[PDB]
């Protein structure tokens, strides 16, 4: 619960731009473009978590996400993500030119429940010709909706986190970058967040999560 929305001064669905957490024992510092945005420093997770995007539409939080309209197809695309370990030999660079099942995995038919109004689907997640992860939400019938999300089979740590991409536009959905781990994976719940509320594209939200 420490969420902080800042302004980018510009719109983010337009095209790529590069976003990034430096997650140390003492503080998060997000950066827009190489630029300093916003530090925390209380209560800072410590434990490593798997790295996730997805693309997904809500219910039940109309105030926070806005209303979903059933707009599709919607598409959020990752050029590139990179982390800088604190420790060697943990560092790793992911251009997304296809899909490597030895060190990422699909998300695929189930839903999380929830806020979360979609199935996952493995179709749904799709690279393109000139390299990049493209996110889909789309529907199979009608108000049934199949959405997607791509996380790492190895879990990481302390360190820099890197990526290049461009977000979905649209009431009611939401597009991510995120560490997570949490009962599912055997520990407490820990994630840090960068997502884009795309009922305003010209906004960043921000967030963690220790022990929640
Ligand atoms: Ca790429």
Redesign the pocket.
């Given at each position: 619960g420490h969420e902080k929305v800042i302004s980018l001064g510009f719109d983010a669905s337009k095209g790529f731009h590069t976003y990034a957490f430096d997650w140390q024992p003492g503080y998060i510092k997000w950066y827009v473009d190489g630029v300093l945005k916003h530090t925390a420093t209380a209560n800072i997770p410590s434990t490593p978590g798997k790295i996730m995007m997805n693309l997904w539409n809500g219910t039940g939080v109309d105030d926070w996400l806005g209303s979903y309209n059933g707009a599709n197809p919607l598409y959020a695309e990752?050029?590139?993500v990179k982390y800088t370990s604190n420790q060697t030999g943990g560092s790793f660079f992911e251009?997304?030119?296809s899909y490597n099942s030895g060190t990422w995995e699909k998300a695929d038919g189930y839903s999380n429940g929830g806020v979360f109004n979609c199935t996952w689907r493995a179709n749904n997640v799709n690279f393109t010709n000139?390299?990049?992860?493209k996110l889909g939400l789309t529907s199979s019938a009608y108000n049934k909706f199949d959405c997607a999300e791509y996380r790492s089979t190895n879990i990481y740590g302390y360190g820099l986190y890197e990526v290049?991409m461009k977000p979905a536009k649209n009431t009611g959905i939401v597009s991510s970058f995120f560490t997570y781990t949490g009962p599912a994976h055997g520990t407490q719940w820990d994630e840090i967040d960068i997502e884009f509320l795309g009922k305003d594209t010209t906004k960043v939200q921000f967030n963690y999560y220790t022990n929640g």
């Open positions: 990752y050029d590139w251009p997304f030119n000139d390299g990049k992860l290049s």
